[PDB]
Design a protein around this ligand. Structure first.
Ligand code: FAD
Ligand code: FAD
Ligand code: FXH
Ligand code: FXH
Ligand code: CA
Ligand code: CA
Lengths: 588, 588
């Protein structure tokens, strides 16, 4: 068991030093390495439950059992004196640089997961390359280093959400005594996009700087894995070459889908285009009902836009549907129109985008409702948010032997290993995992530590909290009510729930009994909290802390024992008492 | 052990029914009681670890061991047939109404704790009276039912905080693209106060309604405890009478202190006056450095006011002082002036308050700095926030035998019992407890359940989270860093910490590396989180959920295993890695 771990660690680490805290010769080694600007991992055996068993199995690799012991890419390099020997003779540089491969790690994809993995690996001496390339959208939109969330995802989405929330801050400001003429207030799309894009630009730059400062090689090149250790790269000039790496991390993410209907690629846009759009979308149709669809519809409406969402069947499939309905009801009551049970048949162009006055074009959308009536309506912008897909045939030679699933995602073990043992996948292309930026980051960093610093900790993908940044935000952690019932049976599920009203909404004259929270609990497991759900402002701030408690196995009694902070929305989780089975109303 | 609990429960409950779920005759009893509008507690013995031992000891009270068993104020009333007997003969009303006392419970004080205790008790059949009276402030300010937080505390304070935050929403709105002429925007104090007061009024009314609907008697009368069971009440007409109750709850709270200097009572105001002030305070001096002082200074400054805080020694004594300094630095950088190491000697009047144009007066404040230089400056309003004190000589005849401490607070056991065994104290007058509205509520409700429904659960006063609603909010749960070090020693404490920047602040051009969080952990107890501290927006929403985890014994590893929600401020608690001892900078 310990020999398995040590065999893997030694084989994989780029530059690793086994050591103890109470060891001067070790410090001498650390100092020479620091002095020489040689990064490495370090495992202090005097701080492990079985450090002394480890010290013994080490002699199966070194033929000695003392510390320090220094390894490079699978080979015992020496004790203290052999390290100093190499140094003094200035042979240490060529030694810690000897490898069969150009790199210890090549990351294909410069997004949330891949950048986090790359940096963390370089920390421990892994010679690292990060490849990133942004295939243009059909209208030619491209962007810089950082991935989907930085450039066309969580970051611009939340900032445009914020611009929409400020709309309601302006309305509220009057009731709290601020004098402002709200009829001479308008929103300027292009000013907002410019501020958003200037922040993204600072992130593109910040990442490039971070990579340089960790001695990671950044290649703005499309990578293609041609064999287990060989990556072919095409640069801006279309020049092709080949680099080699020991470990490979696939972190290439996904791109938006279009529906296969006439006009969709030619005249519609996706989220990829929305967040840098050089004209105001104007009267907009969003096709879809994902969290992307609803978030985009929501902020466009709060910015004053005429907004319609075309929904084929239900809102937020895969989420708790009681909550999804409440999310949708709030939106419909606040200016989002819904074309329900409706699908698009074709987009026709009525006006071309004015690339020189920054005005939208004009489109005719034809579709049909389930009741057979035709949908026909003009929109200035049509946004598709009908899901996302991986692009791996563009990255993976089928001959390498990386197994994909039905949907084109990478089939992985619980340590992110593909069917090719030196090749790993993180982020959105890892089949079956929550598609979220902090998951991708935790995966990539924890993987890098296992590869290059002998760590064993795996990423825990269970009970991963989410927030949907709709106009009224929805945060959740754990199971939907319907999934809990399906799993355990209705008789074993108790649901506590309440409406609430943010104090901020009182003077502002906003709604009673719209915000809402519930805990879905398991009767037979001490009222274990199986899922937490909250609809209200700052729902991501509310939910995050409870995710720690849920990971620790929180019960209803743990919530009750805890004292609220007053006045907050979150404190209502500490006094819930109405159950659903009681029939008593949750209104307050 | 079980006989102790049962003896107390039977003696104390007003109307209680022992029962089992699987008992038709019990349901028959419940139905007759429901039919008759007779409220009562109920203990289903088939749902207790020792319900069957309880069923036996019951015969020491009833001479029977079967369910149902119904008690009223210490006396076995009967089995099913004796209950029905009393009903059919319409003797049940006079039976469940027989008592040596007018009331099963008299609550002296209609605040957070007392109202919560009163309602909860009435639920189980306790005939309850709630007394509340609001002694006017020196300028004559008074208010309605609900206590300090509702009327002159947490509620108006947070709403005026919100009015100040909206100031920064207006500034931010421009950078997110909203066109608004910020130089023709001003704030109107009186409009704000009117909205705030209309909400408080709805709470005053809502409480009166809640009390009526739970058959609680509300007396707007000053109560004085003259013997263990006798309360003397003085009404608006100054008419004096005496009511009697079995249990007494003292929940009379505190009032602001004034410094003993000339002019203070005559010309200054406190928070009691601030939240209904009929004129704008204008150029304001806040004397004090409590969380009250800083919160008030902060929103007055965000409303555009010229604001000065006079500070005798340190900010936020009793709070983590690193955090207090960061709170104070943010305020000084955002328009609050601080007269440091300074105390007031006298207030002189220069202009009388214009009661008919709603304008402030004008005051000359004289004081002195520790360096001997004189302080002399004119202010339109001077606000004292130099602490609060109980008023119990106004409530407690010294002959009753309720022990007070040095500061005039009530000395209580951990079940809130005073030295007079039927008299309990909750809320701010309970010596040694956190002075917070949700503590008072949890205390009062859990006490009511122990008195009148045989519950045993005590209120847990440890690791009670707080938030200070300064312009940059500060949330905390558990120990300050200095208190952890003092308790466990510096070598046993590790502190993880980071700056962070709300995404909302980026486009808005606000500060990097001002918001800040830290976890204070114990090395020798598995890096147990001893205190959590966060400075940033929505800090109360951030902190609340983590208080559940801390109550459950969260470690640093529980935080790390948990996946962030992105983008939020709170997710930074899930990736902390820089320790203080490492000397590495927390900036990001
Ligand atoms: C509108 C939208 C909003 C979202 N909001 C949130 C949110 O609020 N919170 C949250 O947690 N998650 C959110 N997400 C999801 C989040 O963006 C993803 O989970 C995350 O960005 C995926 O990280 P990744 O490492 O898997 O891939 P990505 O971030 O997509 O990075 C993959 C990189 O590799 C590039 N690439 C692809 N192929 C190659 C190749 N052959 N060679 C070189 N480079 C290549 C890609 O162009 C890209 O730059 C949102 C997503 C969308 C679409
Ligand atoms: C400016 C300020 C801001 C605050 N902000 C917060 C916050 O944000 N969050 C938080 O949790 N806490 C906050 N607090 C504290 C909170 O208000 C108290 O902890 C809480 O209100 C105390 O509840 P209580 O039941 O002990 O007494 P109280 O709420 O003060 O109620 C006591 C009632 O009894 C009345 N009374 C007194 N004597 C008699 C008598 N003889 N007969 C009849 N009635 C009598 C009193 O007039 C009063 O109505 C704040 C306090 C202040 C002063
Ligand atoms: C129809 N059903 C009640 C759920 C629902 C809403 O409540 C609100 C908006 C919707 C839009 C599309 C589909 C369903 C929606
Ligand atoms: C002086 N010391 C550094 C702490 C401190 C601040 O940082 C900022 C404002 C203050 C006001 C009064 C007392 C102390 C204060
Ligand atoms: Ca509670
Ligand atoms: Ca984490």
């Amino acid at each position: 068991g310990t020999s398995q771990w040590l065999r893997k660690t030694v084989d994989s680490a780029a530059v690793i030093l086994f050591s103890k805290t109470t060891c001067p010769y070790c410090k001498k080694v650390k100092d020479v390495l620091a002095e020489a600007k040689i990064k490495h991992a370090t495992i202090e055996l005097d701080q492990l439950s079985n450090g002394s068993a480890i010290q013994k199995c080490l002699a199966s690799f070194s033929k000695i059992e003392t510390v320090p012991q220094m390894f490079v890419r699978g080979k015992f390099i020496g004790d203290s004196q052999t390290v100093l020997k190499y140094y003094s003779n200035d042979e240490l540089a060529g030694i810690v640089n000897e490898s069969k491969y150009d790199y210890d790690l090549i990351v294909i994809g410069g997004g949330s997961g891949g950048l986090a993995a790359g940096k963390e690996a370089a920390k421990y001496g892994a010679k690292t390359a990060v490849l990133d390339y942004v295939e243009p959208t059909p209208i030619g939109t491209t962007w810089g280093l950082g991935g989907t969330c930085v450039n066309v995802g969580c970051i611009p989405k939340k900032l445009m959400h914020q611009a929409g929330l400020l709309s309601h801050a302006l309305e509220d400001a009057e009731h709290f005594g601020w004098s402002l003429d709200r009829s001479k207030i308008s929103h300027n799309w292009s000013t907002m996009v410019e501020g958003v894009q200037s922040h993204i630009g600072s992130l593109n730059w910040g990442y490039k700087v971070a990579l340089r400062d960790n001695q990671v090689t950044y290649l703005n090149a499309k990578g293609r894995l041609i064999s287990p250790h060989e990556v072919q790269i095409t640069d801006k000039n279309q020049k092709v070459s080949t680099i080699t790496g020991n470990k490979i991390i696939l972190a290439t993410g996904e791109r938006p889908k279009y529906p296969e209907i006439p006009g969709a690629v030619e005249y519609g846009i996706t989220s990829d285009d929305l967040f840098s759009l050089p004209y105001f979308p104007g009267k907009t149709l969003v096709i879809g009902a994902s969290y992307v669809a609803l978030e985009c519809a929501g902020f466009l409406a709060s910015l004053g836009g005429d907004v319609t969402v075309m929904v084929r069947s239900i809102l937020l499939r895969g989420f708790d549907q009681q909550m999804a309905e409440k999310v949708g009801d709030y939106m419909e009551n606040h200016g989002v129109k819904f074309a329900k049970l409706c699908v698009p048949d074709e987009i026709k162009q009525l006006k071309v985008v004015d690339t020189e006055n920054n005005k939208p074009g004009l489109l005719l959308v034809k579709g049909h409702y389930t009741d057979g009536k035709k949908f026909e309506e003009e929109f200035e912008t049509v946004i598709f948010a009908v899901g996302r897909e991986p692009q791996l045939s563009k990255v993976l030679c089928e001959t390498v032997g990386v197994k994909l699933d039905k949907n084109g995602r990478v089939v992985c073990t619980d340590d992110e290993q593909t069917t090719v043992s030196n090749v790993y996948a993180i982020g959105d292309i890892n089949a079956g995992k929550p598609q979220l930026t902090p998951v991708a980051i935790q995966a990539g960093r924890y993987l890098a530590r296992r590869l290059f610093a002998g760590a064993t900790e795996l990423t825990d993908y269970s009970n991963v909290a989410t927030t949907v940044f709709t106009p009224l935000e929805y945060g959740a952690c754990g199971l939907s009510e319907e999934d809990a019932i399906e799993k355990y049976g209705d008789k074993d599920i108790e649901v506590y729930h309440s409406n609430f009203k943010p104090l901020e909404w009182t003077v502002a004259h906003r709604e009673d009994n719209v915000c809402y929270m519930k805990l879905v609990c398991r009767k037979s497991d001490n009222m274990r909290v199986l899922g937490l759900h909250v609809l209200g402002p700052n729902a991501g701030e509310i939910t995050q802390g409870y995710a720690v408690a849920i990971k620790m196995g929180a019960t209803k009694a743990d919530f009750d024992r805890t004292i609220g902070i007053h006045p907050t929305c979150s404190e209502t989780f500490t006094t819930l008492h109405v159950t659903k089975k009681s029939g008593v109303s949750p209104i307050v």
